[PDB]
Amino acid sequence: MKVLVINAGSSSLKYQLIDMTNESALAVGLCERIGIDNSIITQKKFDGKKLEKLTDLPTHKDALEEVVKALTDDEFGVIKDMGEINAVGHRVVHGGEKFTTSALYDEGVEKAIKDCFELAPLHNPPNMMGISACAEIMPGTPMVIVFDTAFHQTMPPYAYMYALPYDLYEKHGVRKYGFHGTSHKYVAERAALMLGKPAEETKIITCHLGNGSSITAVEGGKSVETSMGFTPLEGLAMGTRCGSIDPAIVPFLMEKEGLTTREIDTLMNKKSGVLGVSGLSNDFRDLDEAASKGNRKAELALEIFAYKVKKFIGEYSAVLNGADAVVFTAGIGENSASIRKRILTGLDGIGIKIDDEKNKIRGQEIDISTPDAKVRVFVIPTNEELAIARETKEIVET
Amino acid sequence: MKVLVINAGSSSLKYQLIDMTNESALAVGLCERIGIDNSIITQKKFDGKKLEKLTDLPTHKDALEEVVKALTDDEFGVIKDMGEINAVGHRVVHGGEKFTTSALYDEGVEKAIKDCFELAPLHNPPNMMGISACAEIMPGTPMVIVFDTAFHQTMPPYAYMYALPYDLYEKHGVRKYGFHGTSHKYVAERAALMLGKPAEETKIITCHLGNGSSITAVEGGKSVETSMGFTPLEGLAMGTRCGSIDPAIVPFLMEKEGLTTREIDTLMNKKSGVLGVSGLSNDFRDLDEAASKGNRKAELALEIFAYKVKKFIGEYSAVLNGADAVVFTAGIGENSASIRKRILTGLDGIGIKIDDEKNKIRGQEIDISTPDAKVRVFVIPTNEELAIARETKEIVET
Ligand SMILES: Nc1ncnc2c1ncn2[C@@H]1O[C@H](COP(=O)(O)OP(=O)(O)O)[C@@H](O)[C@H]1O
Ligand SMILES: Nc1ncnc2c1ncn2[C@@H]1O[C@H](COP(=O)(O)OP(=O)(O)O)[C@@H](O)[C@H]1O
């Protein structure tokens, strides 16, 4: 089965055609400057052939029509006709409580998606232009919407409910949702394979450490607890987000600094995290160098960041009653040997011990723990597009 | 030297008269329903004699006047006249940045306590009322203030700093302080004795579970991390407090419901916790009974509460790199075998296993873990009053 994965932006459209037989990306592409002048589509075919075409792309529908032409090109394409695309997949952030699994697209899902957004306190609404264009160009092809909140819908009530007045949950839907679902589910699946046990028999803690960061406790293949909550702000300190602070600090700051609700929200989401502490950057690479060159604020920001991840590993070890493995993924998790070191030092007491040399390897699924450690520590690159395609294939199959 | 220890709440006042010659509690008492109807003072003398008086107590000053009359009663009292009270030690929750060690009461201490009213809204006002009541009733007696925050001053910067813009820490003193210090320090000491090791060699997790609840990670006798923060609101779900929720919920609620900063603070401190979830009570005894009789909201509130304590045990196990013991104290911690059961179930994976029969014993320092468990679980009655009296003696003596 071949799956086309679409990711649409205001004036762009990224795509990948993936063969699910071998999970190989046959072609990867990008349409830019849509609705602008000098539109362009660029496609890379697996064997090192690149196609570029300067043509006008007024709307996402035009871009998608070109994408199909580029995929079927005699020499630079990978399929003979549009009919070889068995399904299309798209990722949306919030599915609230309406979406407990990925969904087959139709007029119903389009409305539910819009509602989930207007009820949620999220910033950027979902971009539907890619999804819409798809319905016109390929009416007969199954389309699957994948939600980042979906994977966490298996959480029990004592985990997702906040200790707030119950009516707020009922009147405004306030509860923990969780994000990065697609990433957590994918690496949890890879980790089970590396443990050599069927997923149902595994207990895994997954750490998606990127500009946004979240940890999930995966029991027997299902999410049972996660660090982000009602919004992506809860939990860990991140690039520009403060994470879980004393809630009383909010009105205190609003009275002291004379701030509006929008200002305090912006302060917590964009001026906090390691950026806010370091006074320097929200980029962990920059902080790491700065810290070595002796920059104290940068050193403090990385200490706070690693310390909080360490604590969550302890927290989810209790949730899971002993974990079989801890997984690191995303930008920081996959690439930073030093940040992994800061996080994993001082945990032998709970069965975690790593090998400094194995921890230096990069871009690979690898167990970096000593062979005698009770808890395995795996570094597993997350692959967004492939995860979305697997989700799409599962739905289109069943 | 005889020290009177006072702990004042909104409508109550606990006291103990302790002889420092041998550290014996001569009399223990409680004034309840102050400022309400059917006020009552109850006193227990060391020889078992109990006094109860139904009288009207309009203000803390009236209650304190009765306390003195009960302490001097010919048969049920323990001293001949007020002059036998050499000093008074007061429990005060927040002293802010300026006061983080015990202090002889003076104009400056008073100022700091009133300035922190907004930082400990449920506590500082009543603590102040008890101090003023004491100044009027016994003008000539030395008064010593002992802060809930002192014990946590050993926390490292990466634990007490929030991932917020650094200037807020500098300009407004925003950082984690922690509370119940006196209780945590005392039971940590008792736990080291029970482990038969020098405090310096121990790693203990102390859980003070009462109307207010907090956990502390004690390493070698020093507090290294604790659950409450800038204010007593952070951390666990409590009787009427929500604990650590997604901070984004604050601005969100303010906008949806049109709430000012004062109202949202009251909502989080007075209408949340198990009271907010259950819709029934903030008393764990009542919830336990209601849960057993089939009340779902009450059952959910206790699950959320126990689950959060369980997670903190995991969190601090990582902080401490393996703990030697977990300690339960305060109202719920000392008396609820069933709540301890909910909390401690499913942790054998991290070395914690308890004996259901031992867990039924009450009012005793006892190890309730199975003999083979790697981590000991002790139930230890707290004695904040003897600890406050020790400080009072030291300060008044020098
Ligand atoms: N080698 C590295 N060392 C430290 N940090 C890195 C490294 N590589 C990437 N990062 C960090 O990872 C983040 C980008 O990762 P990414 O997975 O794309 O984030 P997100 O999941 O939030 O979209 C940035 O904050 C960046 O500084
Ligand atoms: N046997 C019990 N079972 C469950 N909860 C209890 C029990 N005894 C006391 N509690 C709870 O403990 C809390 C008492 O709070 P605390 O701060 O320790 O003060 P106090 O020592 O004055 O009772 C109350 O919420 C109360 O309902």
From Swiss-Prot, chains A, B:
Stated consequence of mutating residue 384 to A: Almost abolishes catalytic activity. Strongly decreases affinity for acetate. Requires strongly increased magnesium levels for enzyme activity
Outcome, altering residue 93 to A: Decreases affinity for acetate
Site entry: Transition state stabilizer: 180, 241
Binding-site residues, ATP: 14, 208-212, 283-285, 331-335
UniProt cofactor(s): Mg(2+); Mn(2+)
Functional pathway: Metabolic intermediate biosynthesis; acetyl-CoA biosynthesis; acetyl-CoA from acetate: step 1/2
Active-site residues per Swiss-Prot or TrEMBL entry: 148
List of residues binding Mg(2+): 7, 384
Thermal dependence, as annotated: Optimum temperature is 65 degrees Celsius. Protected from thermal inactivation by ATP.
Main EC class the enzyme belongs to: transferase
Keywords, in A-Z order: ATP-binding, Cytoplasm, Kinase, Magnesium, Metal-binding, Nucleotide-binding, Transferase
EC code(s) of this entry: 2.7.2.1
Annotated function: Catalyzes the formation of acetyl phosphate from acetate and ATP. Can also catalyze the reverse reaction. Can also phosphorylate propionate, but has very low activity toward butyrate.
HAMAP family from the UniProt entry: Acetate_kinase
Quaternary structure and partners: Homodimer.
Protein name: Acetate kinase
Taxonomic lineage: Archaea, Methanobacteriati, Methanobacteriota, Stenosarchaea group, Methanomicrobia
